[PDB]
Design an enzyme around this catalytic site. Sequence first.
Site, mmCIF file in Angstrom:
data_model
loop_
_atom_site.group_PDB
_atom_site.id
_atom_site.type_symbol
_atom_site.label_atom_id
_atom_site.label_comp_id
_atom_site.label_asym_id
_atom_site.label_seq_id
_atom_site.Cartn_x
_atom_site.Cartn_y
_atom_site.Cartn_z
ATOM 1 N N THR B 200 -94.370 14.420 -14.904
ATOM 2 C CA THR B 200 -93.697 15.205 -13.881
ATOM 3 C C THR B 200 -92.241 15.441 -14.261
ATOM 4 O OG1 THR B 200 -93.218 13.187 -12.643
ATOM 5 C CG2 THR B 200 -95.220 14.389 -12.077
ATOM 6 N N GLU B 204 -84.144 18.243 -15.102
ATOM 7 C CA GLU B 204 -83.857 17.300 -16.171
ATOM 8 C C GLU B 204 -83.343 18.043 -17.395
ATOM 9 O OE1 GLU B 204 -84.243 14.320 -15.124
ATOM 10 O OE2 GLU B 204 -85.850 14.376 -13.630
ATOM 11 N N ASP B 254 -91.522 21.523 -11.147
ATOM 12 C CA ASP B 254 -91.518 21.529 -9.691
ATOM 13 C C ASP B 254 -91.109 22.862 -9.078
ATOM 14 O OD1 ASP B 254 -92.016 20.431 -7.264
ATOM 15 O OD2 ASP B 254 -90.214 19.177 -7.177
ATOM 16 N N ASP B 459 -97.617 5.093 -4.308
ATOM 17 C CA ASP B 459 -98.475 4.420 -5.282
ATOM 18 C C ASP B 459 -99.242 3.263 -4.652
ATOM 19 O OD1 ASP B 459 -96.970 6.152 -6.953
ATOM 20 O OD2 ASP B 459 -95.491 4.560 -7.257
#
Lengths: 807, 807
Positions: B200, B204, B254, B459
């Site tokens: 993912t 960045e 995204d 998670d």
Amino acid sequence: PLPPPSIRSCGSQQYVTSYIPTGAAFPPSSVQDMISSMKSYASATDLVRTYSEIPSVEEALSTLDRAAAALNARRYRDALKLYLEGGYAMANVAERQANPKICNLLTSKGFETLNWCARLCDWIEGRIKEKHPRPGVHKVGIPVSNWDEDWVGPFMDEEEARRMWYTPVYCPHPIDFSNLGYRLRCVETGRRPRLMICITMYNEGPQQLKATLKKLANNLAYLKEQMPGDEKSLTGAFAGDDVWQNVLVCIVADGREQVHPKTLDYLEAIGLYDEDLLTINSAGIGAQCHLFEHTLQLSVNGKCLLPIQTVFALKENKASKLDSHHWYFNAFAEQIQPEYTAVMDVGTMLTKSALYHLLFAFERNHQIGGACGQLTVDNPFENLSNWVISAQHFEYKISNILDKSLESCFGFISVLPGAFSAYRYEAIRGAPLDAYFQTLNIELDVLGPFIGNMYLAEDRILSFEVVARKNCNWTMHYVKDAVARTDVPHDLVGLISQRKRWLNGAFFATLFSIWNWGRIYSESKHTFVRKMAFLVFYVYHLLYTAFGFFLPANLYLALFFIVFQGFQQNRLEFIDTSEYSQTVLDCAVYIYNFSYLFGLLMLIIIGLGNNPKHMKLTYYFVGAVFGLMMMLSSLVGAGIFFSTPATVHSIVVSILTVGVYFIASALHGEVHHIFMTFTHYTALIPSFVNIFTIYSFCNLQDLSWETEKGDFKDVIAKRRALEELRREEKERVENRKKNFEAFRTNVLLTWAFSNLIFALFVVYFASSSTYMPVLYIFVASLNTCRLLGSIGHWVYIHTEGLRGRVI
Amino acid sequence: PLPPPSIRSCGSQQYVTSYIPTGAAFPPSSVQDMISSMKSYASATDLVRTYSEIPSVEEALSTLDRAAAALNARRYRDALKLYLEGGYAMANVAERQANPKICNLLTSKGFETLNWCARLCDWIEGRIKEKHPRPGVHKVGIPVSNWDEDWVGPFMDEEEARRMWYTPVYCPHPIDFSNLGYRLRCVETGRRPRLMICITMYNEGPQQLKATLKKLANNLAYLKEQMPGDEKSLTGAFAGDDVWQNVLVCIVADGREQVHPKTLDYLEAIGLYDEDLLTINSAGIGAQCHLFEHTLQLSVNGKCLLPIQTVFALKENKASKLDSHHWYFNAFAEQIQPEYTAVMDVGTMLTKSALYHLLFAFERNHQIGGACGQLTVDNPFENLSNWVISAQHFEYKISNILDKSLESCFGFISVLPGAFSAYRYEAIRGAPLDAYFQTLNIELDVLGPFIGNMYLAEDRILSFEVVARKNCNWTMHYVKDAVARTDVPHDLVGLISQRKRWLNGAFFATLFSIWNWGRIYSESKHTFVRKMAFLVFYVYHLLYTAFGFFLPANLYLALFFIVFQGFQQNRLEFIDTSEYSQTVLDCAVYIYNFSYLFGLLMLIIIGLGNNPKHMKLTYYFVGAVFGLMMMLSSLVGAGIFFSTPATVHSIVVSILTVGVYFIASALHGEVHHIFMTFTHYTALIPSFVNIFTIYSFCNLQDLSWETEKGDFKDVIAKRRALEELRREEKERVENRKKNFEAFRTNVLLTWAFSNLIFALFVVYFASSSTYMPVLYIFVASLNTCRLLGSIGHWVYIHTEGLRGRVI
């Protein structure tokens, strides 16, 4: 050079994989052969043509809207094409309709659109030189749907009586309203009204508007009925039988989305709104707002009121109330050029004499630059079982009498919202209005947070600017007889929100005034005596603000010392506590301290946390606890006072502290209200102070607010530029919000820690015998000054009328 | 019946007033005569025609976008007309372009659009029966712009080596990805990969992605290099010389708006992105996301890595990370049907052996339903002068060793974000994934606030669902050798935000697990011994959570009692305080209490007030004060301990309280890190507890998320319906936000007041001699249990490899 891949079914099949070799550039002959080998498209084309045969209203309106959007984007060829298409579509469609009104309106709109298209084509050719060409202005007058035959009035021209006028405006900056060629019915007909009234509206029911209009009609009737030849009677443009021609009423709504539908239905009933006309005539303009004009006639029960000249302006998008005032003042005042200008809200129900008294004061004095009337709660005695209403009634009465009289003695008033306030349109035309609308003309980034915060409540800026205007000596005045009755919230939460906005505005306006008080001496031109009086008032204002800043700590200290340390250390006079187990004596103080601290912590957490609407139970619980504490303290204090054999000092202090309210109330003849509401107001003092101040300080964060063709590379550059601009705008918004939040947090921390440190130091390093006399002296001094101000105002108002002949 | 008003200049002039009588309906002859008396329009028409002669790319793309918008609105005739117009426009424009790639792409798009138009016309005629007709799928493969000639690999087909493939998808619900006819290159070519990895990405820089890809290539090289014939070597699909064909890498971005431009440039460099293809081929579809497919080859310095099969999916609009996992899991996993499934983030730099160890554990055990690797800080010893990095390093090491070993002994792990976690795609296919994506399928109003809050860190839901799956016995495991090195924030503010989200997720996931623990016994099918072990772990979990809930009060009590009441009441052993003025003795306690209370008040006000980015100085100041206090307390405690002559109880308590860390660290061979970072971690304990818990609890509010023609009355009804729907939506959003805020406020108040009341009662009704032994016993018990768990895990990991032959 290679032939195209043998794939003729790209969108026909569900899934097809292909390879497109770049750099080959293809052969034209192969592509032409591939194109010529297709015949199905013809069928589709035929169908489309058939579907395109008949036009529709929706298509025409959508095309006109797209044309307006293109015109706003400075692209002219596309705008011309879309305008021509829409005009032809409307011209064709107009014949189909069976409703005569729709047919006529569509025909007129089509003709206007075609004429505008011709003019735009001429401009594009270069024949005509203009800047920012726009469609021409065209106001439409239509008969009113419902007309009351059984209505009797002074005299009405049929054109004025039975026709309502409408026009949409585009003016982006309201100062250019007159330059662009717009006009009003009153100016067109030759009438020159001298008084104007603005009635701002936003999300209100029809009942409030109906009551306001009825009250205004009653005021006009009273003004007409007055006889001539008397000293009290007004002379000039406000005489009888023609008063209704010198007054104009402007109703400014805030946004079509937020307007209550029943309000629109009522407005349409009285002949001031029509949805079809707005839908049709506003298609191409892209109007900022739409204005309707009429001279409405109202009938209540079997009595017919007087006609009222009304202009209803409805804005397209929601904006602040300051924006509505901007539109009203600039456009309408600059065009009509009136003499006075009154401002009120919707729901303010005036008495029969408010206008007469205001005009009388303005005409008699000739130095008044502004005036405000008395504010009252409607039906106070009815439903006396409610405590919030009674507390608000007492607060309004006491505030009016004491504070307004004291401030009006010196000629400087800080008007509280939302009053019915009148200014003469000669002392506010220039610099004061420029400083009034400074927020709307400059973005908040340049001004800063401190400047932006003070304009939440914006009346005091106008008041101070009028008082301190350069090369002029304007003073304000307070009229007691201009009574305006409003409606107040019945619960705690609405009161909390209202007080939040009021307190924010008041605090920052007061800080601004204290900062800029020097402009009166540096720039203005007053008498020397006036300057000395203003200096004295400045000293008093500083002392009052300083005392009010430290109020929660003083309340805590007074309650603690008197009640609980009297119980613990045996100072209550009606009972002796030298007995008991030494456990109850400490238990009282411990309970008091723990309860107070826990309540304050819970209140601050809730206030800074969430909206005060789903936390109703907690606010009610805290208010009940504080009210019970205050009532217990009041009973204990009354017992202590009555037990003492009394002394000159005791009686003098008691009078000058508590009885000033009753003395001033009896002097002005309003004493029964104090008797009725004193108990109800006494039980809400801690609630007022703590809750309202904390919630006001916590929520300070509430800030407000061309290429026609092209190639591929131009498209890519356009997309990249748009993305860059959007990201920069988002960054700027983030920065502004960060700065405002930091400022509010710093202010809140300063206030809370100052109060806490003062309380702790006074508790630990002082005694109950070396502190209370200072508090008594301070409170007595303030109340003595207020009482002297009230007495002076009463003496002036009852003497000047007789003694003005000499001076 | 009256003639129209004699006004032929409506938009030509600046301002014109007109009257339109409704109800007359006009005569047709007069209107026809008025129309026929106009000739200027022709000129405009001619000009428009000339302007309409030449088309452009921008017009074609805009028309196609409008056609897609109409098709989404279920209106088909307008969509057909716009599609035909756009197709013809593109076909005409394609010949003008001089760039061969643009010409070829435009020609292909025009042909596809025309074929889709023909198919839609056939459907509208009723010839073909379908539901929700959409343009056919058409993926395009083009040569890569830059190709490295000097690159050596195992073997690569030219079609695979030099062609990159692209397609935009429309699938609104990802479960229908396979039904609509989409396909992947790996499935098309016949390859059947067994392992999948999801990476993912959101906002960045290119460096992190480059490092991650290089590390993955190194892992593949290491997996290939291993020799056969050994017991340690893996057997099957993960052998040598063909490992790179069994692994697929999915990179899910995204949102196009938030992607860093340099990241897009780097992706285009390695042949995985092209802006022209996306701009041209996605015009008509209205795609939800666009996917590129390639088999990229990377070269670093003079060494060429192994090829990696990569699929890059870029979403059109920003969504949550859970949405990316939804797309990945459902679409790609259901199509490919792999065996394993690994999840990591961008920037996680794996070692050379992580994949080997994970696959080895999965193959050896055959009961593992999921596994997680060790998390580490990159370059810990470098720049040791930074305290935050060292504290985080110590926290990671201790947490991993103690907590992970203890939890993995019983076979139940609460994975901490964001780890490199692998699940086998057989225990998560059904119910666990349905419970995983429950937030995305049901609106938050039905679920409530408590359910919505826990999915912020999602998670642990998957872990618990896997452990407690019905009719299956799946257990989790922890691998020590799967080391993943990440990068940590260098300042306090980023750490604060990261810990905020971590703490919210962890707290609500823990509450959910405690609530639903009964499903293991009621529904699952485990061994009896496993159920007993889970019961014991449940008891331990309850005790640990209860102790952790009351941590700030215990820290305050311990510090206060030991240090300051030892100084005040002469209990320090290395100095006697029976002397002094009795003023310093009380002054110490008063200073401590006032400083602690003021710090807590300031911290809570700031945390609930504003974003922790423009309040850097205050957070730093509070952290420094607390750190100095903690260091002073540590020195005083060390002196007190060393002065005592010592006893069996003292040494046993000291060991089981403090030395468990060093013992466990030495047992696993990682001891120097503890020596280096113990001092740095000691000075941040109060900061950790107070600041992170308060900020996490304060900001819990962070919630996430057909008529073609017509007449006039239809238009009015449409507008009214749209307004009503908009207002209802706004009301619903308001209600949801109100509920969430109320829930968070209630939780925060409960926590704070529980801590305060417990602290006050223990201070007032207990002594320092009747309270400290209980705290020592509790801490010793918890640390003894953790040490036993760690020793058991080490014994298992070093014994099972040899002792598994018997069982």
